[PDB]
Amino acid sequence: NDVPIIDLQQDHLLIVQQITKACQDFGLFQVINHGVPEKLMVEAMEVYKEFFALPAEEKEKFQPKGEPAKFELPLEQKAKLYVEGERRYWKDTLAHGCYPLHEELLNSWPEKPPTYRDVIAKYSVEVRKLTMRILDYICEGLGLKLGYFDNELTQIQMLLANYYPSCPDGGHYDGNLITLLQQDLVGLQQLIVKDDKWIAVEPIPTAFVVNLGLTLKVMSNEKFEGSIHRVVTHPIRNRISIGTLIGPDYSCTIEPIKELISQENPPLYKPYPYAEFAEIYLSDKSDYDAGVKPYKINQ
Numbered sequence: 001n002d003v004p005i006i007d008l009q010q011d012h013l014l015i016v017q018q019i020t021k022a023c024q025d026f027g028l029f030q031v032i033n034h035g036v037p038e039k040l041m042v043e044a045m046e047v048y049k050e051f052f053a054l055p056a057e058e059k060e061k062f063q064p065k066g067e068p069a070k071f072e073l074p075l076e077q078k079a080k081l082y083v084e085g086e087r088r089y090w091k092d093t094l095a096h097g098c099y100p101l102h103e104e105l106l107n108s109w110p111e112k113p114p115t116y117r118d119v120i121a122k123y124s125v126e127v128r129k130l131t132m133r134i135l136d137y138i139c140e141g142l143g144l145k146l147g148y149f150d151n152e153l154t155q156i157q158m159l160l161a162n163y164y165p166s167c168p169d170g171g172h173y174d175g176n177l178i179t180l181l182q183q184d185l186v187g188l189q190q191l192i193v194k195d196d197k198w199i200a201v202e203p204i205p206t207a208f209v210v211n212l213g214l215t216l217k218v219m220s221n222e223k224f225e226g227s228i229h230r231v232v233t234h235p236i237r238n239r240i241s242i243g244t245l246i247g248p249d250y251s252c253t254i255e256p257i258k259e260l261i262s263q264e265n266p267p268l269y270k271p272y273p274y275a276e277f278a279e280i281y282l283s284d285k286s287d288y289d290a291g292v293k294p295y296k297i298n299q
């Protein structure tokens with residue numbers, strides 16, 4: 001496995017160097033000793049195991065007008081079941097916003113299992129906290145002031161809990177800024193561009209896989225790579241994974257961070273509305289970066 005595993009209790013400068021190199025080379029890495037309670041990660045996975053085992057009577061409560069929603073605008077934050085492209089569906093996703101944790105938002109979350117709201121609220125807070133630490137390591141690697149992304153660029157925090165039914169014998173960037181993913185079974189693969197080859201991202205049940213989204217690829221002016229990754233169906237196990245997809249509010253304007261831009265390293269994208277990007281990203285799957293192709297410049 002060539003995917004870096006970065007221990008967040010090493011000396012501070014080694015963390016920054018390792019994260020920086022991973023962001024430049026792959027756009028994907030794993031973190032361990034990351035400060036999120038292991039007992040909470042286990043409880044959250046147990047919550048989704050139970051949720052996906054509930055009977056139809058419960059699951060229908062998350063299916064607007066009798067069927068799962070699609071990832072299409074407007075992308076609401078209330079909890080809903082989603083599907084995304086059929087295969088030989090292939091994936092059920094429970095998704096909802098998590099930030100800020102409002103009463104009206106929490107009130108849309110599952111009531112069963114009865115621990116869902118307490119466990120997943122605590123998990124959201126912890127995963128967010130860790131996500132903001134990692135962005136700050138990225139700030140130091142890019143030479144940006146700490147806290148640069150602690151604003152509307154991280155205003156939206158979508159939890160996407162995925163269930164992949166087994167089959168005996170899908171690639172994308174995430175369009176947002178940064179994603180943390182918890183898994184405990186093989187199935188996640190990263191595209192190694194230089195070989196045009198898919199490789200396994202080893203499942204470490206107490207680690208988080210960190211992958212950079214298209215928005216960060218653009219804002220770093222391609223100093224950092226976004227991760228192109230996919231999931232292959234498990235031949236034996238139903239697989240569950242928990243993604244926390246953090247990024248801009250839909251009222252944001254995305255552009256290469258001006259402080260990174262020079263005469264020698266000009267901007268590679270013009271500014272665009274995130275909401276306009278989001279529409280293309282969700283609709284046009286003709287290429288991985290179709291969402292940002294209309295904004296490319298200096299090529």
Ligand SMILES: CN1[C@@H]2CC[C@H]1C[C@@H](OC(=O)[C@H](CO)c1ccccc1)C2
Pocket residue numbers: 071075084158160172173174175176245247277278281282
């Ligand atoms: C596998 N798919 C991919 C990634 C997750 C899942 C569902 C969809 O991605 C999203 O819905 C996220 C939600 O924040 C998104 C939506 C608009 C703009 C930026 C990011 C596409």
Ligand SMILES: O=C(O)CNC(=O)C(=O)O
Pocket residue numbers: 160162174181183187188229230231241242243
């Ligand atoms: O489920 C996995 O292991 C990977 N999930 C995704 O890439 C996603 O939901 O965007």
Ligand code: NI
Pocket residue numbers: 172173174229
């Ligand atoms: Ni993804």
Ligand SMILES: [Sr+2]
Pocket residue numbers: 060063066067068
């Ligand atoms: Sr139904």
